[PDB]
Design a protein around this ligand. Structure first.
Ligand SMILES: *[C@@H]1O[C@H](CO)[C@@H](O[C@@H]2O[C@H](CO)[C@@H](O)[C@H](O)[C@H]2NC(C)=O)[C@H](O)[C@H]1NC(C)=O
Ligand SMILES: *[C@@H]1O[C@H](CO)[C@@H](O[C@@H]2O[C@H](CO)[C@@H](O)[C@H](O)[C@H]2NC(C)=O)[C@H](O)[C@H]1NC(C)=O
Ligand SMILES: *[C@@H]1O[C@H](CO)[C@@H](O[C@@H]2O[C@H](CO)[C@@H](O)[C@H](O)[C@H]2NC(C)=O)[C@H](O)[C@H]1NC(C)=O
Ligand SMILES: *[C@@H]1O[C@H](CO)[C@@H](O[C@@H]2O[C@H](CO)[C@@H](O)[C@H](O)[C@H]2NC(C)=O)[C@H](O)[C@H]1NC(C)=O
Ligand SMILES: *[C@@H]1O[C@H](CO)[C@@H](O)[C@H](O)[C@H]1NC(C)=O
Ligand SMILES: *[C@@H]1O[C@H](CO)[C@@H](O)[C@H](O)[C@H]1NC(C)=O
Ligand SMILES: *[C@@H]1O[C@H](CO)[C@@H](O)[C@H](O)[C@H]1NC(C)=O
Ligand SMILES: *[C@@H]1O[C@H](CO)[C@@H](O)[C@H](O)[C@H]1NC(C)=O
Ligand SMILES: *[C@@H]1O[C@H](CO)[C@@H](O)[C@H](O)[C@H]1NC(C)=O
Ligand SMILES: *[C@@H]1O[C@H](CO)[C@@H](O)[C@H](O)[C@H]1NC(C)=O
Ligand SMILES: [Zn+2]
Ligand SMILES: [Zn+2]
Lengths: 619, 619
């Protein structure tokens, strides 16, 4: 007649080799017994042998309630009208749940083409024996840009959230890992995948935190889809592309139940309400025996945070996805407690100055002669800024850590130098009792130029490297005697030891690097201040000296953890996600959160250097 | 046998009514003669009559080089697992260009289902006689969420850019208008549409500017896709949804060729190099006859601008899409020249102060007695700020107008009050020659609270309304005699006339509204300053008075155009795009760009009030 329609009764796990004309159509009738409980996923797999350029095979999979139709050799899209041609196509068949416990279910495969030559294909329908994922058990597979895959997970009895971790041992097939509910169809194509769910482009690691209140089915599909071009991960006639494949590994493990939150917050209070206990008991017994930054920052952040929450495109906020414990609508709630050190110490510092000035004033009322002529003259208008600034660093970082990003970046660390600036100002306002804000603004502007060029050319880096060493020998002679020539020994080597470290690494983060120059230069001056006392008639009581060794150590651990993550921020969040790590402390905090703890203790303990350093000069 | 396969030879523009079992499949063989030049688009259309709940029809359209397969009644997705069921499906068939001038082309339709009851459908394949769009000719059609449509445009001989304008007379089907190249397939589904191209959610208006350098085919497809739920436009068992349809209208018109740019830029220079000409000729003949805002602003903007340029999601930047002439990578280049008034007048102002102070200093060298005791004492450290501030308002608005948005919003107008503040400070520093920055920061913070609540509840508005009238009677008695009680007459009514206007409209924009309070309150004080002179022995020369009438008028036109668009910024850029308008002046500038022109002339002409107002007090 017009055409030829052949109706074979097909079988699972067998390979059929056949031929189709422009005048022949093949229909295969597969059938499987589905069970309500032990769902198994069917998976079709076709492969056209030595196809010419004439006309594709057209494959239709007809279930009871869905039609899925593709054409082999599949042709996929590049950026600039580039085409890729895959000879081998695979697809898992979505199928909805059943009201009966077990029932027989049919589906048909229809193979046809409109080319006048006998095309030979290779059809094999095989059942998946590893569909449903199990909690805490690794699993490996393969996928290409023509053969997307997806697996099922269903939450156990009494697990309210999991974290789907997917890893790969190599870089450049670029996968997308979407997470979708269990209602057919499954959006596992390059165009479909971004439609719904909450995805994550991966290169070596992806981690998605899932909570079963969003899934009334108590289950979800994990969908892995490779991409034709690697531009979104930092890479560089149809072009056959079947030679490019990706091996992966998926592990689903339960998240922290509820105690890591309670035992995490009872750790911040336990070591900062400890200082309040300590100083009060130390002071009591012994004695008688800015807004211009608050406004623009926050309202951008609230706008930016909800975007992912309402879109599920997790390439926006540069969290540490392996340790990011959500609470409410906050996706990294453990990076916000970490900023309790500033809010609880920058305030405690102010209380110290209050009573210090209040205790002082009574001496004038007592008509003390010392208060008028003995000791360095009082100036507590700068201490009230250091105490104020610290409290404002734990508020512009708690707002940065709601979506860390290239845009949001300057908010925290730029204000950090201000704190370091006041320490530099106070020492110079001490010895020479008779401005720098431009330099802090310049540094921010330089970091802004270092923000417009953070991944800037290495030519820019050596420009900064050269300029820094010029400013190294410039400020060297500003404060310049055997002891004086001792200064330039370390004052120039340490800066060399840092600028050189820049070229060896070229951290994509810049402002955070300048912070390293900040302390590493400043911390030297403290010694330069102390060596003045030791090599003169000046002395040190045990109260200030004790606050010198301790704070010189907490600046050691802090600068260690501040270095544990320094390159853990790159372009293309897919690359920046390769560096995430599990939670070190209490399984709630990681390296960075330790830095927010140690920095606030390093700084507060260096304020109480200045406060009591020149307190032996009273008499 | 196993099934029944019927092979009909079908015909165009006829309606076939047939039945299918779980044991019958229909195959229709359509054929059309395609021509290289006059491409016509085929369009299938199926409709299932009184379908039960059992099992869908499955439709496959098999061309020579593509398979398109759906299932009727189509089921579409809501937000929270809501399903919608369409009984009627339509689709235009994509088909690639032909190497022959004209050739016969076949395609098959396959109708089959797996339900055991005779389902009756209604298949009609009809050719489209209005496929290819023509330049400058309106065109109307219809579409639903099951029947997406797309049309073709190909650029004429010598037209380098067009603007696709689509309008609708009603609001709430939410369409998406993508623009894609002419390579099959066409992504005209809810999931596909966002994949590639450059789309725009519409409610009443959409306008996409297209440039044929991005399309080597010299043509593109305009794709219209309705949406099931109206949430993205501000709205509120499967639920049958075929009763909801959208009528549209598409007009493609050529953009400004090249002269609107040259004749636009030769308009900014012609009226600001005019002032330089004017004042120099007026002065010469007659006489002898901050950085803390530059850094955070810009680098966010460059990051934000390229996102649309690399994604084509034009619901991000709140341009005026009907008048937005691109140049380079800037999408609204006519909103950036408009800010040449500040850069060219805030600088000219400084030149005035220079020679004013330079001419002054020689009087002291000449040992003039007047310069020491006659006239109000000189203080040009505040004028050098007003001249500096103006130049910095035409730089934080030229950076805002690269993507206007809720986040980017505060950059320009917040700094505007600073300029108004110095004018208020100068007058009070004049009469009382012996701070407000907190109020400007508070206003920004209040506008920040008005930014966190811009669309805030009307309860918030009346709070501001009540508080403003309290501050109306508060500052009234600060500066308080028949003339003194004249002050409170207008000083309180005008503020009432504004706060009341707020409740009648409740503009979603807030900071811009506060600007209206800014001038409308400030502008009254100028009169309050002038009425002091007129009702005393004080006088006015013709040089200052001339600069009073003129600047009181340019504050009339400016506040007119500043009101022509005040609600033209809402939530959901689909709604905010209903308010766009064509270009008024030179077909390059619109209402807002006139405001950037008149504001800079209104301000500069009010500085030269203060400069020369009290210049009759010399002797
Ligand atoms: C369902 O498919 C199976 C194939 O897996 C069919 O079972 C075959 O039946 C034939 C005829 O008796 C025998 O070769 C075997 O019993 C089966 N073949 C196998 C297991 O390879 C079965 O007929 C199909 N069901 C229906 C209703 O057609
Ligand atoms: C993924 O693909 C790789 C091939 O790239 C598979 O590795 C092959 O299969 C087994 C397992 O090692 C060996 O017998 C072959 O020699 C392997 N080939 C190579 C080149 O290594 C791997 O098994 C696949 N992963 C699966 C099936 O889970
Ligand atoms: C292409 O389709 C057309 C239908 O539009 C077929 O033309 C029909 O041919 C029959 C047989 O002679 C006659 O009824 C008319 O000539 C046509 N019917 C119409 C116009 O309604 C034509 O046969 C098809 N071509 C092929 C090769 O099958
Ligand atoms: C879009 O649909 C409307 C119906 O909602 C069509 O209007 C109908 O068709 C013609 C044109 O006015 C009239 O004879 C009918 O009475 C109209 N019905 C109603 C209720 O107004 C309109 O024609 C369609 N647009 C097209 C086909 O371009
Ligand atoms: C296939 O078509 C040919 C026509 O040449 C003829 O043998 C018959 O119609 C069909 N036979 C089979 C086995 O399909
Ligand atoms: C199982 O499914 C069949 C349809 O194949 C249906 O007729 C039957 O009612 C179902 N079982 C029960 C217990 O309802
Ligand atoms: C293959 O093509 C030949 C034409 O040479 C034709 O006779 C034959 O029927 C086709 N199919 C097979 C299975 O040989
Ligand atoms: C349809 O199937 C029936 C079987 O009951 C039989 O008439 C024949 O096989 C087929 N007839 C037609 C016209 O398709
Ligand atoms: C027109 O198309 C046919 C295929 O149907 C092809 O054989 C022929 O070569 C084409 N015409 C020319 C001039 O190449
Ligand atoms: C409709 O269903 C009946 C069963 O009652 C069956 O006999 C018949 O073949 C079906 N088709 C038509 C066209 O009547
Ligand atoms: Zn931090
Ligand atoms: Zn503006």
């Amino acid at each position: 007649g017009p055409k030829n329609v052949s109706q074979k009764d097909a079988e699972f796990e067998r390979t059929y080799v056949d031929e189709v004309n422009s005048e022949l159509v093949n229909i295969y009738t597969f059938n499987h017994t589905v069970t309500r409980n032990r769902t198994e996923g069917v998976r079709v797999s076709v492969n056209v042998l030595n196809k010419q350029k004439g006309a594709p095979l057209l494959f239709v999979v007809r279930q009871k309630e869905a039609v899925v139709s593709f054409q082999v050799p599949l042709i996929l899209r590049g950026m600039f009208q580039r085409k890729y041609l895959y000879q081998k196509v695979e697809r898992t068949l979505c199928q909805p749940p059943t009201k009966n416990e077990s029932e027989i279910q049919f589906f048909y495969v229809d193979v046809s083409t409109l080319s006048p030559v006998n095309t030979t294909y290779q059809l094999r329908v095989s059942r998946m024996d590893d569909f449903v994922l199990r909690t805490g058990e690794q699993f490996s597979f393969n996928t290409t840009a023509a053969q997307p895959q997806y697996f099922k997970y269903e939450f156990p009895e009494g697990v309210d959230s999991v974290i789907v971790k997917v890893t790969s041992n190599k870089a450049f097939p670029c996968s997308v890992i979407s997470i979708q509910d269990v209602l057919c169809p499954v959006y596992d194509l390059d165009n479909n995948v971004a439609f719904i769910g909450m995805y994550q482009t991966m290169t070596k690691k992806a981690a998605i935190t899932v909570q079963r209140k969003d899934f009334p089915s108590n289950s979800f599909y994990v969908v892995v889809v490779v991409k034709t071009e690697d531009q979104a991960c930092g890479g560089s006639e149809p072009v056959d592309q079947g030679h490019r494949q990706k091996t992966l590994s998926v592990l689903v493990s339960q998240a922290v139940t509820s105690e890591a939150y309670v035992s995490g917050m009872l750790f911040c209070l336990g070591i900062f309400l400890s200082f309040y206990l300590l100083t009060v008991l130390l002071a009591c017994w012994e004695n008688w025996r800015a807004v211009f930054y608050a406004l623009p920052v926050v309202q951008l952040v609230i706008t930016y945070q909800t975007v992912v929450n309402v879109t599920g495109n997790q390439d926006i906020c540069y969290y540490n996805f392996l340790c990011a414990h959500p609470l409410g609508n906050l996706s990294a709630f453990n990076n916000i407690l970490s900023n309790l050190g500033y809010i609880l110490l920058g305030l405690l510092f102010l209380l110290i100055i209050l009573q210090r000035e209040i205790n002082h004033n009574r001496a004038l009322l007592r008509n003390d002669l010392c208060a008028l002529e003995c000791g360095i003259p009082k100036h507590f208008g700068l201490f009230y800024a250091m105490g104020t600034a610290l409290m404002m660093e734990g508020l512009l970082s708690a707002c940065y850590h709601v979506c860390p990003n290239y845009t949001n970046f300057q908010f925290d660390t730029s204000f950090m130098y201000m704190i370091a600036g006041l320490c530099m100002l106070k020492l110079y306002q001490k010895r020479h009792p008779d401005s720098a804000y431009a330099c802090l603004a310049i540094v921010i502007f330089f970091s802004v130029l270092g923000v417009v060029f953070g991944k800037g050319n290495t030519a820019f880096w050596i420009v900064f490297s050269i300029i820094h060493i010029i400013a190294t020998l410039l400020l060297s002679t500003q404060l310049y005697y055997v002891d004086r020539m001792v200064l330039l020994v370390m004052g120039n080597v340490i800066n060399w030891s840092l600028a050189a470290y820049g070229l060896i690494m070229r951290p994509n983060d810049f402002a955070s690097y300048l912070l390293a120059i900040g302390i590493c230069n400043l911390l030297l001056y403290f010694a330069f201040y102390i060596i003045m006392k030791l090599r003169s008639g000046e002395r040190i009581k045990l109260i200030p000296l004790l606050c010198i060794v301790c704070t010189s150590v907490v600046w050691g651990f802090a600068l260690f953890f501040f270095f544990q993550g320094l390159s853990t921020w790159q372009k293309t969040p897919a690359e920046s996600r390769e560096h995430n790590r599990d939670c070190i402390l209490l399984d709630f905090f990681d390296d960075h959160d330790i830095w927010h703890f140690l920095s606030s203790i390093a700084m507060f303990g260096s304020f109480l250097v200045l406060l009591t350093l020149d307190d032996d000069l009273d008499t």
